[PDB]
Design a protein around this ligand. Structure first.
Ligand SMILES: [Cl-]
Ligand SMILES: [Mg+2]
Ligand SMILES: [Mg+2]
Ligand SMILES: [Mg+2]
Lengths: 434, 433
């Protein structure tokens, strides 16, 4: 039932071009936009960039836009398939591309259409997007996720020495999602004053995801600042800490560099075992309940060893790239126990849902995720609810490419009323709350 | 007519609560959100905050929301008025409020509904939002505005010694609005590198509007950095600079302090004349074609004198605070020649349009503006096009509460097709195009 499709180039939260797709049906216009990461794993589906240095510094996405309007569009229209057939329409583009990593049209082109298709499908069945997604996934009793706000940005997301990428707070003890937003925001505002008083005002500017980017090096200090903010806000024991190390960003010849943003100096490099011993101290001295990408995307041995020696959540991101093939290996080698779900790491809604179900069926938790480069699109809000993962990270409660998703989640909770439950302390496995 | 009105509390780009309204008609759902404003004041409309220091540091807006759901909503529904009747519906809310500055219900409450009504009205007319606004204002020759990107911040918006508040780049030489976005984005990224190499990576983070706030004191240094970025990007002949001094922030005992962020010392204070002399140098040495709030909101003498002695655009912000009465005085005293248009500062769509037309009818330019605390709402994009102001400032090309507007403007340009026209070098008076 697809009448027409038109893609365009828009700008993401960092000012870089990205793909946006408008899809028309008898129900009206449905548009979606595609995110873009900065710390991208080498195994992620291909993000097709034009490479025209004389334009957007080679970051244009006209090629991906043209593939959509000139090749993908006519094909989906010809199929005559209803937009409710997410799997059939997605597989169609997959075949049309014909490559494993979507290197012909680009994962950004395919995903742009896939997303618009899903929104049109929900309208076709007269249902909110989150409910439609739930049916596509095979879920009934939906639930609001615990939000993980990245309030201190480091790594390749900020201008500071801080090597680790994200320090997140999770309002596990909130009464509802709306309440979770309040605690998150309150801690964030308290944290601004905590940082300002110790490092000055020039340390309250933010990184790509809205978290403060203080001029610090020690990751322990970041944790200390967050913990102090939590306590000062009066939410100790109601808010826990999450981390995204994104170790692949500072992996240097088997070793790890916790100061890679400074002039290269191998003498400061540390081994995997040392890095792991550091994490143990963090989990011991701080309320750290989740650590994402603690080791390089290829350093499997380190993942298995660490995970087997911790009782917290270990999240695969660059390790798994929302890819079933990589997920299968991680589950067999018990490399981690949670999957970070990024629709643009694989390239289609169908594959993302499949990756999610695969993790869930193996006892893994699943945290839906934005990319460091986001747009005003809010698809992941409805996605996390429909997939009942119980957890999502989509930024600090700062910068609207972040708030747009959090605001949408509050609207979802409002619409569901007493039909949905907050994940709370069961963010790892909310299927028990039903 | 209106079937239902439901308001809720959402978070703005800084993490503070604000008002969002859902308006229902036979046509469907129409929602809009309100940007950050001011709770206190004497001229501008005031936003109503809860004041509960225990909740959101006292920045909640539950009261404003309550007024919409338990008061405004039922009143507008009963009237049976069509959403196409913007003026009548807005007037009804103004009378329901009673105050002169919308201090009872809150400017954020009234504007929220006003914005939703306008979006719903456009649907009833079966027209895009920018077109509906154009008809409400009496315009037909729509025009795409030149964007003014705030890439370097100072004053109260930064932790540096830099006194002046905003340093913007305007792609007046762009071929279209889409092209203007590319130029702005390319210069922004180029600027980031220039700052990283000169000040260090630790100075490449962004402020509330997405611009950079390097540790600098000299205002000429900020201009120098922007100029270098423009040149390095290769657009020296297509991009000019706009400034927002926000002089009210450093106005001291009838004088001005270009280092007010340092320990008080009136011996460094400068007079209006001296401050104007500095601007004179900025205009001669850099491609500055526009300066906002060069003097205090009450220092009328300095405004009129400066405007009469320069040829650049002079924009009233705190001076005019989007207020008809203030605008009238500024017009009669020739204090400035451009109105910064902040819808939430007046409180209603109807009143904002009237303030815009008042300015335009008096030979003034008009630059639509965002607020420090923005939302994912894109209303002002359609507004600047429908009003044909020729210029808008809604952030650096960074942080989506800014990009949402810019992307929407690109969609509008695309929608206009061949009829699309870019203000370009005539951003001050697109009336000629
Ligand atoms: Cl403002
Ligand atoms: Mg990454
Ligand atoms: Mg990650
Ligand atoms: Mg101003």
């Amino acid at each position: 039932s697809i009448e027409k499709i038109w893609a365009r180039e828009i700008l993401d939260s960092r000012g870089n071009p990205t793909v946006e797709v408008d899809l028309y049906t008898a129900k009206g216009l449905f548009r979606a936009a595609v995110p873009s990461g900065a710390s991208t794993g080498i195994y992620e589906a291909l993000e097709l960039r034009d490479g025209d240095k004389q334009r957007y510094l080679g970051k244009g996405v006209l090629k991906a836009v043209d593939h959509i309007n000139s090749t993908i569009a006519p094909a989906l229209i010809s199929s005559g398939l209803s937009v409710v057939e997410q799997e059939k329409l997605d597989n169609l583009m997959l075949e049309l591309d014909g490559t494993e990593n979507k290197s012909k049209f680009g994962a950004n082109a395919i995903l742009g259409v896939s997303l618009a298709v899903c929104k049109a499908g929900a309208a076709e069945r007269e249902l909110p997007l989150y409910r439609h997604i739930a049916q596509l996934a095979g879920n009934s009793d939906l639930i609001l996720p615990v939000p993980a706000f990245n309030v201190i940005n480091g790594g390749s997301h900020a201008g500071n020495k801080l090597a680790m990428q994200e320090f997140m707070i999770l309002p596990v003890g909130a009464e509802s999602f709306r309440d979770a937003m309040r605690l998150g925001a309150e801690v964030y505002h308290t944290l601004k004053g905590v940082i300002k008083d110790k490092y000055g005002k020039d340390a309250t500017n933010v990184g790509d995801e809205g978290g403060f980017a203080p001029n610090i090096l020690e990751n322990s200090e970041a944790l200390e600042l967050v913990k102090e903010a939590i306590d000062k806000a009066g939410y100790t024991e109601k808010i826990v800490i999450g981390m995204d190390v994104a170790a692949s960003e500072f992996y240097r010849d088997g070793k790890y560099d916790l100061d890679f943003k400074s002039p290269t100096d191998p003498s400061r490099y540390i081994t995997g075992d040392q890095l792991g011993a550091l994490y143990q101290d963090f989990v011991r001295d701080y309320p750290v309940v989740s650590i994402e990408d603690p080791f390089d995307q290829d350093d499997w041995a380190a993942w298995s060893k660490f995970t087997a020696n911790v009782g917290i959540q270990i999240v695969g991101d660059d390790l798994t790239v929302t890819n079933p093939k990589r997920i299968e290996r991680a589950v067999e080698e018990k490399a981690c126990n949670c999957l970070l779900l990024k629709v643009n790491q694989i390239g289609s809604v169908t594959e993302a849902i499949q990756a999610c179900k695969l993790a869930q069926e193996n006892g893994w938790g699943v945290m839906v995720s934005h990319r460091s480069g986001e747009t005003e699109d809010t698809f992941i809000a409805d996605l996390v609810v429909g997939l009942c993962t119980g957890q999502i990270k989509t930024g600090a409660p700062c910068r609207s490419e972040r708030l747009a998703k959090y605001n949408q989640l509050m609207r979802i909770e409002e619409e569901l009323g007493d039909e949905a439950r907050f994940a709370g302390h069961n963010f790892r496995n909310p299927s028990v709350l039903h």
